[PDB]
Design a protein around this ligand. Structure first.
Ligand code: V8E
Lengths: 300, 237
């Protein structure tokens, strides 16, 4: 198990670690998070008590380095940094642990939620969507726009999700206009899976990362990407069975984890009604359809 | 965006534009079968593509063979319309290509946009105007060429005859829409109005009779009377 120490907590803040969260008071003796499960990406996120504007946070993998958080009073935020001195880092963590100044990542043993939400998410792919090569961890916030949003304005601060556009030449073969617009199988299988993503795991990893950025930061462009990647599969008549069954699992755990009160801002009525009730795959997502109907029957 | 009453004069400016009406592309008669079921029989149709400034009509005849063995024909008809309009644009010299295409039915928007992806600078627009272009098949010379077609064929016409020698495009379009609205509302009575004087004929090179300016005023008034009369009959007014 790994640890992300905090130098201190000078401003009151709600701290998230994956799907958990806790409040820290101004100048409280808080010095980090321990017992973080090895084997998954993680996200440590922040919303300031005095300014709920800018949710922000950092995607990281403790296998890649030793990371800590320190507040920067000039830029006004908690920053993730890497400690290259291993003995220094171990000494810091051990003292904070001995003084019990750290919260424990509160994973229940029966609980596979985080695995289920991050099954296909890899740090190496995150670092290609979020481009800042000098760090091993990735900053995301509520306001960052996507490459696609920008096309329709600082490129160094964009979310480089794969652009999906159903009325584009990339999606429509000349001479197959009706076919390709009504059945997106070419665009999914040849353009996206074989061409850009190389395999379904990378596709699902980006879909999962988009959902998580939408949920944890309220990042609008991420929500758009998540819905586009769902609709592309559901609007394809020919999808490998293993992908359909995996999608049903992915979406089930995403809908399960979504805060009930954020459904009006995180779920697109058109996309979900189309995917569950009109699309080629309307009968292929049994688990997702059941949770959606029982949890959000109003949306439908 | 959408074309409506506010931006109506735009139809007659110097930016090339075309109206596309697909209402007569897929035409059927419905009938009983020997077993007492119902079946359709397709008849030849047409795409109505009109330049409202110049009166040039590109009448693409849709022969019934294009439906043979095809399913979901009402859906296919929209995509066939878009394919043909796109083909027409590509066939025109660059300086004759439209800058806007206005579809009379909003269901044509996506099919046409998708077929025109190679022309990103050609705006595809809907309209809020209720235009009577479905009544194009009430113009005898247009109906005749559509019905006689034995294969796909593109037929070119000027739907304003020689009117632009004497009136503006705005007035010509208004006259056309009045005539078509009257033919749509009561075809028999409208045709009677247009032919009630044997001495006024349709030139071999024209679609409409050779009325003088004063006779057109009388004809237009009679067409408005017909439309109002039919409104009163319909609503018991
Ligand atoms: C007004 C009645 C004249 C007529 O029959 N058409 C035939 C087709 N059009 C020639 C062409 O297609 O280029 C001239 C108009």
């Amino acid at each position: 198990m790994n640890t992300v120490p905090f130098t201190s907590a000078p401003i009151e803040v709600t701290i998230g670690i994956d799907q958990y969260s806790f409040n820290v008071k101004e100048n409280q003796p808080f010095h980090g998070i321990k017992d973080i499960p090895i084997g998954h990406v993680h996200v440590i996120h922040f919303q300031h008590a005095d300014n709920s504007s800018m949710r922000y946070g950092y995607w990281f993998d403790c296998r890649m380095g030793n990371f800590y958080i320190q507040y920067d009073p000039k830029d006004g935020l908690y920053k993730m940094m890497e400690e290259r001195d291993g003995a220094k880092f171990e000494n810091i963590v051990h003292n904070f642990k001995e003084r019990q100044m750290m919260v424990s990542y509160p994973k229940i043993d029966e609980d596979d939620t985080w695995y289920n939400l991050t099954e296909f998410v890899q740090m190496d792919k995150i670092r290609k969507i979020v481009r800042k090569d000098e760090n091993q961890f990735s900053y995301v916030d509520s306001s960052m726009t996507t490459v696609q949003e920008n096309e329709l304005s600082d490129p160094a601060h964009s979310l480089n999700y794969t652009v999906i556009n159903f009325k584009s030449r990339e999606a429509i073969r000349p001479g197959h206009e009706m076919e390709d617009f009504l059945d997106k199988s070419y665009y999914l299988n040849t353009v996206m899976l074989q061409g850009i993503f190389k395999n379904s795991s990378n596709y699902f990893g980006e879909l999962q990362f988009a959902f998580l950025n939408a949920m944890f930061f309220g990042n609008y462009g991420s929500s758009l990407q998540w819905h586009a990647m769902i609709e592309l599969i559901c609007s394809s008549a020919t999808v490998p069975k293993h992908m359909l069954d995996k999608l049903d699992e992915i979406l089930y755990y995403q809908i399960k984890t979504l805060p009930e009160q954020y459904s009006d801002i995180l779920l697109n009525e058109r996309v979900w009604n189309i995917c569950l009730y009109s699309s080629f795959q309307k009968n292929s997502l049994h688990n997702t359809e059941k949770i959606m109907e029982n949890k959000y029957p109003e949306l439908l | 965006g959408a074309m409506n009453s506010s931006n109506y004069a735009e139809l007659f400016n110097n930016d090339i534009k075309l109206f596309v009406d697909d209402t007569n592309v897929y035409r059927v008669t419905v009938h009983k079968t020997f077993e007492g079921n119902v079946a359709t029989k397709a008849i030849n149709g047409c795409i109505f593509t009109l330049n409202p400034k110049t009166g040039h009509l590109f009448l693409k005849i849709i022969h019934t063979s294009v439906w043979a063995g095809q399913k979901r024909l009402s859906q296919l008809a929209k995509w066939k319309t878009a394919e043909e309009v796109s083909a027409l644009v590509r066939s025109l010299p660059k300086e004759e290509q439209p800058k806007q295409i206005i579809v009379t039915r909003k269901a044509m928007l996506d099919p046409l946009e998708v077929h025109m992806l190679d022309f990103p600078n050609i705006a595809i627009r809907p309209t809020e105007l209720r235009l009577p272009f479905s009544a194009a098949m009430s113009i005898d010379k247009l109906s005749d060429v559509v019905m006689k077609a034995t294969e796909p064929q593109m037929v070119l016409f000027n739907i304003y005859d020689d009117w632009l020698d004497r009136i503006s495009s705005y007035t010509a379009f208004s006259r056309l829409t009045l005539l078509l609205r009257a033919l749509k509302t009561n075809e028999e009575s409208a045709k009677m109005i247009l032919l009630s004087d044997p001495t006024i004929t349709i030139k071999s090179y024209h679609l409409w009779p050779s009325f003088t300016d004063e006779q057109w005023i009388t004809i237009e008034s009679q067409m408005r009377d017909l439309i109002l009369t039919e409104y009163g009959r319909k609503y018991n007014v």
